Amino acid sequence: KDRDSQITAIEKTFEDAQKSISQHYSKPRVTPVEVMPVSQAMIRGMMDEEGNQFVAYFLPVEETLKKRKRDQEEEMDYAPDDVYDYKIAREYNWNVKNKASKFFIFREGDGVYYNELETRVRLSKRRA
Amino acid sequence: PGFVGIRFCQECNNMLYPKEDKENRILLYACRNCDYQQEADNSCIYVNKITHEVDELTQIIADVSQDPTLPRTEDHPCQKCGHKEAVFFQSHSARAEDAMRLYYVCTAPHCGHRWTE
Amino acid sequence: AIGQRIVATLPYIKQEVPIIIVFRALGFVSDRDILEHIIYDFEDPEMMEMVKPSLDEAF
Amino acid sequence: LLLAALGRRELDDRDHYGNKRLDLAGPLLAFLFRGMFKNLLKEVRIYAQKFIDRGKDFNLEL
Amino acid sequence: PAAIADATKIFVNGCWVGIHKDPEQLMNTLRKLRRQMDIIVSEVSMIRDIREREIRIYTDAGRICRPLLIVEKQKLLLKKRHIDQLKEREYNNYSWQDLVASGVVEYIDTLEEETVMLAMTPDDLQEKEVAYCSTYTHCEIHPSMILGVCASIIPFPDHNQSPRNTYQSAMGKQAMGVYITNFHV
Amino acid sequence: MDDDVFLRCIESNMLTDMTLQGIEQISKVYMHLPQT
Amino acid sequence: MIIPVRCFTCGKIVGNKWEAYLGLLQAEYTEGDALDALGLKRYCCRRMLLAHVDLIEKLLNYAPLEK
Amino acid sequence: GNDLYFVKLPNFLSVEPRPFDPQYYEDEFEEEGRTRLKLKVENNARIVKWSDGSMSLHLGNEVFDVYKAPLQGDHNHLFIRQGTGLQGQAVFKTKLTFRPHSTD
Amino acid sequence: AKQDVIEVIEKAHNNELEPTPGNTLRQTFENQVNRILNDARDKTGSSAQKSLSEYNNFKSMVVSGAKGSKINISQVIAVVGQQNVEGKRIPFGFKHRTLPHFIKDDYGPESRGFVENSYLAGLTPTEFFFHAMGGREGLIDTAVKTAETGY
Ligand SMILES: [Zn+2]
Ligand SMILES: [Zn+2]
Ligand SMILES: [Zn+2]
């Protein structure tokens, strides 16, 4: 149709989301409490095997066997199909070879700022 | 006694019919399509079990232990694996009058032992 | 006559047809092939003797 | 059939509703529509045949 | 054909399409797929006959079925959160279809009921001094749903002789009332 | 016909028509004391 | 379709109580307490108010024949 | 800071993976065309939390009430994979599990 | 009565039940179970009948012969009893089941259509369906006998 209206309509949401809100859409009876403002790569896990890519699932604050998840590629023919594992050492830990399991968009409280970081390709790993 | 199975020719794969060789006075199994013959090894040509004394344990399959609608019991442990639980069921098969008899099957996976009390 | 014969009442045909004839008309002439298609467990002579009259009637 | 004759399977129950189907408005109107569309295509065949036999075009709307 | 002995046949709408080696986890996969509203739609019936190794799948029309509550080990999948979202049905547009899509409810046809072990009420799922079943798979939403439109008007129909309930179900249809609101036109 | 087929035929016949005891057309008989 | 004038059983007037009954119900009365406030003490008149379905309100959703 | 802020928007509400910038936006799209332009104009976001517990989407004058379904079938570890380190420097933020379905 | 039927079932399951002359083992088991349950129905009906006072109006109408019978009183007060289809207990219309609510091969009284409630107590859903089956039998009989009897 036209761009001089699209520029202002896209900025219009960027401006209206920051106004004062005190009412619902269907029945304006519910008062708001707070607001949650908004590449990526997520390793899916199988619910039976129950996969521990992080130390959270292991119920751990930090890595008791590492200090940096150096997510490095499995090979040269697999950029999206890397090999994520929590091993700072060349130790034969759980080698979770994140196969290519090729919208699931992710965001965060980035200091109450307007951005996005939608995911690129749902990979899923197993115990190799 | 036991039943007798059908046996097929080695050339035309048709069923071999019984025949008698007077020259040797011996049973043969010969095809009426090709000209094949074979020396029998059972000597029995027909068997009718009028009493129908069939072991229904052979008709049961262990997979029936996966049926949620069958009753389970802990009172009859398995003699082959020692599992406590076991499904039980009646014959429910025609030509079996005394069919209140119970047949048991072990619910342990990959055991599948079947028996009767 | 001797045993129990299996027949098949096909559509548009006003006469019973032996099952073995139907199997052969579909390209399965060898009795082994027909019973491979009918009897899946060759360790069971009961099924075998009960199908045998149909074979004996179609030779 | 042999399993039934050997007693290894139960005869099927004519009354079991698992063995039945309910012919509703849609599948019934479909039976009508098949018959009626076939009759329509037939009538179109006769009408178009009597024209092309004369070696000239015809109007499908008629 | 030698493989058909131990294998399980698979029929789809009456057509024998193939065979399988582990029917149990096939049925688990297919039930998971139907309960997730994946490729299998809700009205598809999937019966595993175990003693005879058929697995019959039906998608054709005319199969009368009814909804039932799926049951976990010995628990309903209908948790209190579903009832909570159903209470505010008119605000959050959480409807019946969300209940079916959650894998909490399932449509079971007459032929798949043969393979189902029903609980008349969740009270049947309680552990008892002598357990009747302890391996239920579904539960009634309410037994009174076995009645139709005209029998659902009888009060206390389980305290009448059944012919009386039939005669009322016939006589509710000759009863006067307001057959429709726009009767003036 | 060959001998074996003849044996099978007479087997199937004897097992049906050979009346060892009793009167034909009478399938079952129950003996009892009438209380009435 | 509309609240009857009299109670069918005794003949007590209930026609003037439907609107008051509804007003009491929106005033967070229970149906029993509302029926007590209107003076319907016999269960026949309580039947009249408690089992009434105001269908006239639905018949008034249709435009009349003449404007 | 580290809280789950995962949402799953349908096809007709696909928001841009990057902030709106005039050097990354262009005019290419036009009842038939009315659903077409709404992909790159209405689609930055503020997920409001109400008092009843539910959330809603605010991308303009229209409000889409969302429901934060919490799924135990897709427990993928969501991470900001930016091309910088060895192979996509996945930063550990929040594991995706709960998916919020927006709709009119 | 239900414990008695359970005992007969246990006997049959253990092959500790031998058939009586003139019947197969299934028919003998059915006879034993039906005898137990008929005895239960009659005993409960007698209990209800003796419980009645001289002011009871059911008893008044039954005594005068105006309407009703002692079996009706028993079904209203004590127990409705066994529901029969074609003179037998409720058939296994499912696969070795009367309803999907029962286990397979359950010849117990409640599985096969014994209504252990009265009409005042109220029937359970399975008792309700089995009673509807038994009543449907009477409706069919009433509607089908007429043509043959009139002819
Ligand atoms: Zn040969
Ligand atoms: Zn075992
Ligand atoms: Zn009154």
Curated annotation (Swiss-Prot), chain A:
GO molecular function: chromatin binding; RNA polymerase II complex binding
Record-level GO cellular component terms: Cdc73/Paf1 complex; cytoplasm; fibrillar center; intracellular membrane-bounded organelle; membrane; nucleoplasm
Keywords, alphabetical: Coiled coil, Isopeptide bond, Nucleus, Phosphoprotein, Transcription, Transcription regulation, Tumor suppressor, Ubl conjugation, Wnt signaling pathway
Localization of this protein: Nucleus
Gene Ontology biological process: cellular response to lipopolysaccharide; endodermal cell fate commitment; mRNA 3'-end processing; negative regulation of myeloid cell differentiation; negative regulation of transcription by RNA polymerase II; positive regulation of cell cycle G1/S phase transition; positive regulation of transcription by RNA polymerase II; protein localization to nucleus
Annotated region described as Interaction with PINT87aa, given as residue ranges: 1-97
Family that this chain belongs to: Belongs to the PAF1 family.
Subunit structure: Component of the PAF1 complex, which consists of CDC73, PAF1, LEO1, CTR9, RTF1 and SKIC8. The PAF1 complex interacts with PHF5A. Interacts with POLR2A, TCEA1, SKIC3, KMT2A/MLL1, SUPT5H, RNF20 and RNF40. Interacts with UBE2E1. Interacts with PINT87aa which is encoded by the circular form of the long non-coding RNA LINC-PINT; the interaction enhances the binding of the PAF1 complex to target gene promoters and may anchor the complex on target gene promoters, sequentially pausing RNA polymerase II-induced mRNA elongation.
Swiss-Prot record, chain B:
A single GO BP: transcription-coupled nucleotide-excision repair
Residues that coordinate or bind Zn(2+) 1: C9, C12, C31, C34
Zinc finger motifs (TFIIS-type), residue ranges: 74-116
Coiled-coil features, chain-numbered ranges: none
Protein location: Nucleus, Nucleolus
ZnF endpoints (C4-type): 9-34
Zinc as UniProt keyword: yes
InterPro entries the UniProt entry points to: DNA-dir_RNA_pol-M_15_CS, Rpa12/Rpb9/Rpc10/TFS, Zn_ribbon_RPB9, Zn_ribbon_RPB9_C, Znf_TFIIS
Domain of life: Eukaryota
Alphabetical keyword list: Acetylation, DNA-directed RNA polymerase, Metal-binding, Nucleus, Transcription, Zinc, Zinc-finger
Gene3D superfamilies listed in its UniProt record: 2.20.25.10
GO molecular function: DNA-directed RNA polymerase activity; nucleic acid binding; zinc ion binding
Similarity comment: Belongs to the archaeal RpoM/eukaryotic RPA12/RPB9/RPC11 RNA polymerase family.
Protein name, as recorded: DNA-directed RNA polymerase II subunit RPB9
Swiss-Prot record, chain F:
PTM comment, free text: The tandem heptapeptide repeats in the C-terminal domain (CTD) can be highly phosphorylated. The phosphorylation activates Pol II. Phosphorylation occurs mainly at residues 'Ser-2' and 'Ser-5' of the heptapeptide repeat and is mediated, at least, by CDK7 and CDK9. POLR2A associated with DNA is specifically phosphorylated at 'Ser-5' of the CTD by CDK7, promoting transcription initiation by triggering dissociation from DNA. Phosphorylated at 'Ser-2', Ser-5' and 'Ser-7' of the CTD by CDK9 (P-TEFb complex), promoting transcription elongation. Among tandem heptapeptide repeats of the C-terminal domain (CTD) some do not match the Y-S-P-T-S-P-S consensus, the seventh serine residue 'Ser-7' being replaced by a lysine. 'Lys-7' in these non-consensus heptapeptide repeats can be alternatively acetylated, methylated and dimethylated. EP300 is one of the enzyme able to acetylate 'Lys-7'. Acetylation at 'Lys-7' of non-consensus heptapeptide repeats is associated with 'Ser-2' phosphorylation and active transcription. Regulates initiation or early elongation steps of transcription specially for inducible genes.
TM region positions: none
Domain of life: Eukaryota
Location within or outside the cell: Nucleus; Cytoplasm; Chromosome
Family membership noted in the UniProt record: Belongs to the RNA polymerase beta' chain family.
Protein name (record): DNA-directed RNA polymerase II subunit RPB1
UniProtKB/Swiss-Prot annotation, chain H:
Signal peptide start and end residues: none
Tissue: Highly expressed in skeletal muscle and heart. Weakly expressed in placenta and liver.
Cysteine-cysteine disulfides: none
Localization per record: Nucleus
Function text: Component of the PAF1 complex (PAF1C) which has multiple functions during transcription by RNA polymerase II and is implicated in regulation of development and maintenance of embryonic stem cell pluripotency. PAF1C associates with RNA polymerase II through interaction with POLR2A CTD non-phosphorylated and 'Ser-2'- and 'Ser-5'-phosphorylated forms and is involved in transcriptional elongation, acting both independently and synergistically with TCEA1 and in cooperation with the DSIF complex and HTATSF1. PAF1C is required for transcription of Hox and Wnt target genes.
Recorded family membership: Belongs to the LEO1 family.
Subunit and interaction comment: Component of the PAF1 complex, which consists of CDC73, PAF1, LEO1, CTR9, RTF1 and SKIC8. The PAF1 complex interacts with PHF5A. Interacts with TCEA1, SUPT5H and CTNNB1. Interacts with SETD5. (Microbial infection) The PAF1 complex interacts with Zika virus French Polynesia 10087PF/2013 non-structural protein 5/NS5. The interaction with viral NS5 proteins may reduce the antiviral immune response by inhibiting the recruitment of the PAF1 complex to interferon-stimulated genes, thus preventing their transcription.
Source organism (scientific name): Homo sapiens (Human)
